[PDB]
Structure formats: structure tokens, C-alpha cells
Symmetry: C3
Subunit: 308 residues, 3 copies
């Protein structure tokens, strides 16, 4: 029950700023107090500081930041702590997942997102890296990436060892990549048909039939519906509801196999207040904005927070 | 993959105006662009122009309009195009369904609505025709209808060949008609018990056990909850949510047997904005009002639009 | 089909006033008209007027009020009427349930609430009695309660004969009491996993395997999500939705075994308006605040109000 906290305030994978503020906001809202009350101990590492594709925006900053995160996270993973990586946009999952993967070669990844993040630079509508991070992590890139030379000899994640859950906003070319690479995916319609519980059980059975693999959770908060998670940059209608995302995190916690996690795309500047109701009983700041509070509650779920 | 578009701006089946504006609003919002991007071809026909019961409001206008729609739609159906009939209030479904039925004698009808629309003139609380249209189509009327003489020798729809889905606001007498005529109905409580997916599968198995019949979808947008579809004249609490109505249309599209469809009761004047989020990726006008946008997205589902 | 209506305007189990106004507000909104239209007859009794633990707030007022309610309700129960007890905060369920229990010794209780109300005075964070009422009713109190001497020789409710449904906001010590006393409980996560229908069926099978026991429903309106029930003092995120709470009440009505019911924690002063939509068709005041209207609709469900 030791968690290393790593702030990864990278905001270069997409146009906007705001997400760079996520890590410190969550600390302000009571991250340490929440971890404490759940009976975990933490080590807060602070914040990460900061032939070829030529069409990836801000790639220099991203590559240099990612090397730093890769190195820092590798060191925390070696302590056999649970490692919590707080973004930042989703670009931070490349180094997060690959560092975890080098240590846990049988790692299984649950990517929770409204989006596929599985564009390659030649299919991307935007040139924004956060929309390509999963493709990059999966080894789907066809050319070298400037400032990622340090990463070229790493082992990459395999599609069959991954499940994407909650998706509903996929680009035209992206749809083809999704089917082609054989990744396991569960759309919001699958969730509507079968319920979130059956969906995650199905996903886990698919990628870890023997229930014996370490799990990395990469949670993009925009997987959650706008009603509950307004504080994020790229919204898509029809998301996971409050009950669903909480149940999903609880089920993943109960595997007892989660070794690392990203929580990405929280943008405090975009967030709103309810606010404070009696049920906000974790040691979270009164009247905290609702997405920040949800982030902390979802982190609590992964650390074993339960209704009874 | 050819669709005929028929605008049916009838607003006489109920008190309000607004719905007469629906057809052109949907065109403005990007109807043609949406059909194009899905790889369908369209022919836009434009807009329909315009012993006895004595207690039906505006019946002259309704009867005369319905003859015109019957004739116009009959002609489009003969091309073996998919025919999309955009209302207008629900009164336009009488001619829509009966013209389709004369051509497709084994037609099965899925009536998606918060209401039964199955009052007869002697049970109607309002005298508004849009609340009687299904009863009329089913041959449940007991007297002749002024200005409907042209329709008296048509074959009428049978209750056992129909399923009403999503209902929750039914008048006292209407409840008796519903049980008496033996129509298949699936209330919002059935949907809550079994989920939208099991419900539509059950309905389809009930009315088309051999999966071999052409299908007409009559979609009243007020079937959808107020939260997602404010732009409609007669609201009822506890409607289909965004995920449910999208899944329902997708499942119906996947039968590959849908030959015609009404989309009725959209009232642009009553509609509101979110607005524009990243997930609004169909070629729909940026910041379009949310019900209009939903209408277009639901039309896209029927034409095969899917998440991946 | 005779219902006795008892107004129990007790507000001393918690800090706030507002709930004392609930009973008369529901009458103003059309309680009698609703009962009438459902074909029930009512007798409106009006409103109840008004070694040891030393840490229970307002206990004198609560104990004295509870004796009065116990006596009044005992008398109504003897008529073999369905007895509807309208709070007031949840403190009124002690006398309600115990009076019903003395008459119906095989009573089964369905406690519908976001909270456990199962603190004992030595674990209570607040000293507010409404958060202890279920523990008190279950005989879990360890010391005598001032002004409850009249109750000391009553038979208390047993945990195995009780099901709590909808819970999501439970205090730390309370979680231990919940597991220890062996009460049957179904959290919002159980509801999310299995659906409200499977949950209530499971609960009923658990506590009444032979489907032969009288049922008391203790409905705290804060079980319902904030979106639908803002007019209540202690809100918790992720509650039952409009479709769920309506279905739950319908299923309980259909047992045909409900003999008594509390509807508690409605605070008109906290309530808001939609307002009036076509679907508000029960004889409820036009534009009534939404929680009050929901209360009446849920009472209608218990008296057999159904979609068709
Ligand atoms: N598919 C879009 C949207 C990406 C959204 C990124 B994410 O999931 O981290 O918010 C793009 O490639 O630009
Ligand atoms: N049952 C009511 C309401 C009808 C609603 C019509 B509809 O479904 O087209 O909105 C009436 O007969 O007036
Ligand atoms: N557990 C809290 C909250 C109680 C809420 C009471 B109720 O369910 O009637 O709203 C307390 O003991 O103070
Ligand atoms: Mn993402
Ligand atoms: Mn995303
Ligand atoms: Mn209709
Ligand atoms: Mn309708
Ligand atoms: Mn309560
Ligand atoms: Mn409560």
C-alpha cells in the first residue's frame, strides 16, 4: 500500500493550456488527505519539469518531456509502489505505459476514453499528439519521431494486450486503424447493450483470461459524460455516467492487480461547481469543482474506497 | 443506397406551429451533407404544399395535405428508394405508413414515441389529430373522416404487425384501446427492466419472427428525454436517453430491412444549444441546436453511421 | 382500497426546517385528488401535533412526538387500511415501523435511502437522530433513550427482515455496523451492476422467500438523484433516476402486500420547478415543484398507477 505520485503537466499534445494545472489542483483539492484516509502511504515525487515525421505539433517539447517522465517513472516502478501518473494531456501515457511495460512485460492496459487516440501522423486531422498516443505506444507509427530516439529500442505495447473502453468519437481513418490492428474495443453502445459491469468483465477475460497479469489503467476523464466531467478539453456526447465510472474503477481495484495508472485531460480552467453536498465525504476541499472532485474520488476507488 | 427526402410541414394535427419549420431547418443544419458523407445518394423532393366525425380539429387541412403526401410518397416508394419523411407533427404518419403498406404488404411498423397516439375521436381529450394518428392508421376509427374519402379503400395497418416503443404518457381511455386492439407495446418501464437492446430485439422477434419483413420506423422525437430533445411540443418525463435512442436506431439500421421512416414533432422554435463539442463530427452546422443535431445524427444511424 | 393519511411534520431529527412543511405541501399539490382518481378512498387524519444516552440532539421533542405518532398510527393500522405516513425527517420511521410491526409481526421493511441511517449515538458524526433511526428501530442502541420509555417493551425490527436499497453515502463506523448486524443492503453499485429490477426482486426473494409477508416501505426521497429530487436536505451524488424510482415503487405495489409506507425528507423550501409538461397528467397542481410532484407520483405508483 505505497503509492508514488508523479505530476506530468505536459500540455503540448494538444492546443490548449489548462491541463498543465491539473496536478497541483488535485493536490490543492486534497489528494494527500484522500490517500492518507484510505490507509495508503505516498511518496510525492513532484512534477516532471520542462525517415522522420514532420507533421506532429509541438513534438520537440513532447519528446523531451517524455524522456524525463520515462526515466522518473521507471525509478518509481522499481520500488514496487503503485505509480499514479497525473497529467497533463494524454500524451503522457506513452512514457507511462512503456516504462511500466519494460518492468511488467505481461502488462495489460485498460484505456478509458471517449476517443481512440489511435491516429497515426498521416491520418491525424489535427496534428495533435494526444490524439495519436495510443497508436504510438502500440508501435503503429511508420516513421521515426523527432526527439523520441531514446525510445526506439523499447518494447512496445501489443493491441491484443489492450482494451479501449467508452469510445464514441472516432475519426474516419481511425476507424480503419482500430479494426486493422486488432485491438479490443468496447464502445458506448456495447456499454449500453451489456452494462458497464459485463463490459469490463468481458474486457478483462479477453486480455487476461487467467487473471494473472499486472494492469495499467490509462484514464482520460473525457470518457465521462459532460454532465459530470465538464472540466476537459475535448467533449463527446453520451459518456459514462457518475455511477458507471465509479463502478468501473471499483471493479478494476478489486482485481488487486493494478500496478500503475494515468489520470489525464482534467482541465481545471474548464471545470464547474455543484457544489458541496453531504455525500462529498472524502477529505476533499468543500465546494471543489466537480471534475476535480470526481478525479479524486476515482483515485480513491482505485485505492479501495467502497460504499460499504 | 438511394434516399428520397420528403418534407411534410403539416402542423394542423396539434395546436402549435414550429414543426412546420422542421424540414427546412434540418436541411439548413446539413441533411444533404450528412447523407453524402455516409455514401448515400439522395433525391430531395422538396416539401408537400398546402356518419362522419365532427370533433377532429383542423381535419380539412389534414385530410387534404394527407392526400398530397400519400400520392407523392407512393411515387417515391415505387423507385425502391429508402424514403425519409420529415414532419411536421405526427399526423403525417397516416399517409406515410399507408402508402408504404400498399407497396409493402408485409410491412412492420416500429412506432417510437412517449405517447400512444392511439386515441379515437370519441376518446380524445384534446381533439388534436396527432394524438389519434396511430389509431387511424390501424383502422380503429368508427366513423368516416371528413376529407379522407380518398383513403377509404386502402388496406390499413394491423396491430399485431406493429410495436410501440418508449411510451410513458397514455390517457385513461387510451390505455383501454391499447390493451383491446392487441398492439405490441413496450413502455419506458419495460425498457428500464430489460434495457433498450433486449426490448427492440424482443419487439422485432414478436412482429417479424422470421426476420424477413420490410420495416417502417415512425420516430416521434419526444420519445427522447427532455434533456437531449427539448425542441418538441409535448414533453414527458423519463424518456429515452442519448445512448438509448442512438443504439435503437443503429439496431434498426442493422436489420437492413428499413424501407421508410418518419421523423416527426421536431420544433426548432422550442430547441436549445449546448453547444458545439468535439464529438459533433458529422457535417452538421457548428453550434446547431441540440434536437436538430440529434435528428440528423439519428438519420445518420439509420443510414449506417456507427462508432467504429 | 382505503388509505389513512398521517402527516408527521417532525423536523427535530436533523438541523433543518422545511420538512415540517412537507405534509401540507403535498396536500396542496393534490394528494387527495391523486388518491381519488386512482379509485382509492382516504381518511386524512391530519398532522401529529407537537444508563441513558446524552448525545442525541433534540431527543425530547423526538421522543414525545414519536409516542404520539405510535399511538395514532396504531389506531389506523387496526382499521386494516393502507397507512401512508408523510414526514417530516426520517426520524418518524421509528414509530411508523414499530407500530406496523406490533400488528404485522412478519413485517418486511424496504428502506429506500442514499444513507444507512444506521449510526448509533456513539458512532454518529452529527448527533442528528434521523441518521440513527434505522439502528434504533433494529434494536441496536446500547443505552436507554430519553423520552422513549414508552417504547422499551416493544418488539424491534430484525436486520434479516430488512433490505436497504440505494445506499451510497455511509459513514466510516456505519460501514462496520452495516456488516456486523447482517442487514441486507443493496448499494447504488449493485443497482448499476444488476439494474433496479433485478435488485428489488433479489431483495424481496431474500427477505420474503415465500412471498407471503406484509411490506412496509420507508422511502427517503434523497435516494433519488439530485436532478429529479432537489428538494431534500442531505444530497448524495449518483442517485436513483426518475425511471428507476418509479419502477421500484411499481414493483413493490405489484406484490399486493404493502400495508404501510413512510415518505420522508421532502423539503419544499429546497425544491425547484421544471416545470409543467404534458406528461404531468395526474391531478397534480400545474407547475408544481418537481420533488413534490415526484412524491405524489410515487405515492400514485404504490396505489397502482401504471403506464398502461
Ligand atoms: N481524434 C481526434 C481527437 C483526439 C482527442 C485526444 B484525447 O482522447 O486525449 O482527448 C484527433 O486525433 O485530433
Ligand atoms: N394523448 C394526448 C397527447 C398526444 C401527443 C401526440 B404526439 O405523440 O405526436 O406528440 C392527446 O391525444 O392529445
Ligand atoms: N450518516 C449521516 C447522514 C444522515 C442522513 C439522514 B437521512 O437518510 O434521513 O437523510 C449522519 O449520521 O449524520
Ligand atoms: Mn485520450
Ligand atoms: Mn479523450
Ligand atoms: Mn407522436
Ligand atoms: Mn409523442
Ligand atoms: Mn433517511
Ligand atoms: Mn437519506
Amino acid at each position: 500500500k505505497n503509492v508514488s505520485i508523479i505530476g506530468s503537466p505536459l500540455a503540448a499534445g494538444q492546443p490548449l493550456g489548462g491541463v498543465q494545472l491539473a496536478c497541483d489542483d488535485l493536490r490543492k483539492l486534497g489528494l494527500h488527505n484522500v490517500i492518507d484516509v484510505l490507509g495508503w502511504k505516498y511518496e510525492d515525487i513532484g512534477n516532471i519539469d520542462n525517415c522522420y515525421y514532420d507533421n506532429i505539433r509541438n513534438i520537440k517539447e513532447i519528446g523531451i518531456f517524455s524522456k524525463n517522465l520515462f526515466d522518473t517513472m521507471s525509478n518509481e516502478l522499481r520500488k514496487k509502489n503503485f505509480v499514479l501518473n497525473i497529467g497533463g494531456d494524454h500524451g503522457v501515457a506513452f512514457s507511462s505505459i512503456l516504462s511500466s511495460l519494460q518492468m511488467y512485460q505481461n502488462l495489460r492496459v485498460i484505456w478509458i476514453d471517449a476517443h481512440g487516440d489511435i491516429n497515426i501522423p498521416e491520418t491525424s486531422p489535427s496534428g495533435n499528439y494526444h490524439g495519436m498516443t495510443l497508436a504510438h505506444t502500440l508501435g503503429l507509427f511508420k516513421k521515426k519521431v523527432p526527439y523520441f530516439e531514446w525510445s526506439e529500442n523499447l518494447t512496445y505495447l501489443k493491441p491484443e494486450n489492450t482494451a479501449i473502453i467508452g469510445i464514441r468519437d472516432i475519426d474516419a481513418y481511425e476507424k480503419i486503424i482500430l479494426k486493422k490492428c486488432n485491438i479490443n474495443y468496447y464502445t458506448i453502445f456495447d456499454i449500453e447493450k451489456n452494462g458497464i459491469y459485463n463490459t469490463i468483465c468481458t474486457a478483462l477475460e479477453k486480455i487476461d483470461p487467467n487473471s494473472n497479469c499486472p494492469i495499467h489503467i490509462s484514464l482520460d476523464i473525457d470518457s465521462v459524460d459532460n454532465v459530470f466531467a465538464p472540466g476537459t478539453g475535448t467533449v463527446a456526447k453520451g459518456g459514462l455516467n457518475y455511477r458507471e465510472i465509479n463502478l468501473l474503477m471499483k471493479i478494476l481495484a478489486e482485481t488487486k492487480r493494478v500496478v500503475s495508472m494515468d489520470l489525464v485531460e482534467y482541465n481545471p480552467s474548464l471545470d464547474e461547481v455543484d457544489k458541496k453536498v453531504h455525500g462529498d465525504s472524502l477529505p476533499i476541499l468543500d465546494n471543489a469543482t466537480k471534475t476535480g472532485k470526481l478525479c479524486l474520488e476515482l483515485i480513491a476507488r482505485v485505492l479501495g474506497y467502497d460504499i460499504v
